[PDB]
């Protein structure tokens, strides 16, 4: 019972756009210490994407005000905006640790050597969430999360290159997000571009091994690689 009860709940919360409920449910499914299917795995990923997405979107807006207020020399107001920006940060960080803990305690730990596709998926996700911490961290805390993200992405990419077709959505997605890590977090555009251009070219090369069943996903992500490339290179 209990598992299907939570999976059912997760699906209703997705339809209801109640992503905090969706996340508590997939957290509880994961904590059962049994493996996830592709479908379950995507529910986990959707739930946390949307939770943390709302925090980052909020963080960004308040951060932006804080910088304008510092610039304006407004001391009394700045202390209030900063407090609120930091409250939103605490919520954001908690969402990311919670995920990363699940990746460490359950999801990555339980992958076989031969579960290349799961390993790639969860490592990309570890990379993503350390990257979300890196968007808001400073000082020596920043350097740690920056490193952990790169280590995760690098490991996932090694495996994807060896074990996945260049047109596989999880690979392209990983490429897209790693290239973002380099461009935004590492402030290293040259590196970000080759990586994105390599993955694009590589997908282009093998288009006649794409089954119709994923023409939607892989062209969608390829389009986003090219947008990032034209945006950055200018």
């Amino acid at each position: 019972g209990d598992r299907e009860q939570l999976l059912q709940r997760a699906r209703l919360a997705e339809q209801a756009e109640r992503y905090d409920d969706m996340a508590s449910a997939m957290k509880a499914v994961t904590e059962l210490n049994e493996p996830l299917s592709n479908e379950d795995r995507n529910l986990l990923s959707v739930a946390y994407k949307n939770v943390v997405g709302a925090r980052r979107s909020s963080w960004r807006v308040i951060s932006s005000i804080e910088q304008k207020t510092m610039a304006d020399g407004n001391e009394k107001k700045l202390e209030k905006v900063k407090a609120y920006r930091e409250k939103i940060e605490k919520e954001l960080e908690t969402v990311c640790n919670d995920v990363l803990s699940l990746l460490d305690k359950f999801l990555i730990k339980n992958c076989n050597d031969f579960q290349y596709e799961s390993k790639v998926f969860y490592l990309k996700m570890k990379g993503d969430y350390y990257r979300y911490l890196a968007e808001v961290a400073s000082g020596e805390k920043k350097n740690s999360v920056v490193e952990a993200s790169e280590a995760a992405y690098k490991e996932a990419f090694e495996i994807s290159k060896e074990q996945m077709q260049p047109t596989h959505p999880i690979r392209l997605g990983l490429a897209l997000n790693f290239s973002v890590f380099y461009y935004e977090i590492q402030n290293a555009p040259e590196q970000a571009c080759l990586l994105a251009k390599q993955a694009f070219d590589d997908a282009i090369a093998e288009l006649d091994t794409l089954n119709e069943d994923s023409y939607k996903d892989s062209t969608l992500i390829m389009q986003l690689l090219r947008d990032n490339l034209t945006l950055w290179t200018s």
Binding site: D128, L172, G173, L174, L176, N177, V180, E184, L220, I221, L224, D227, N228, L231
Partner: peptide, 5 residues
């Protein structure tokens, strides 16, 4: 500046 959906 999109990331993976």
């Amino acid at each position: 500046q999109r990331s993976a959906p």
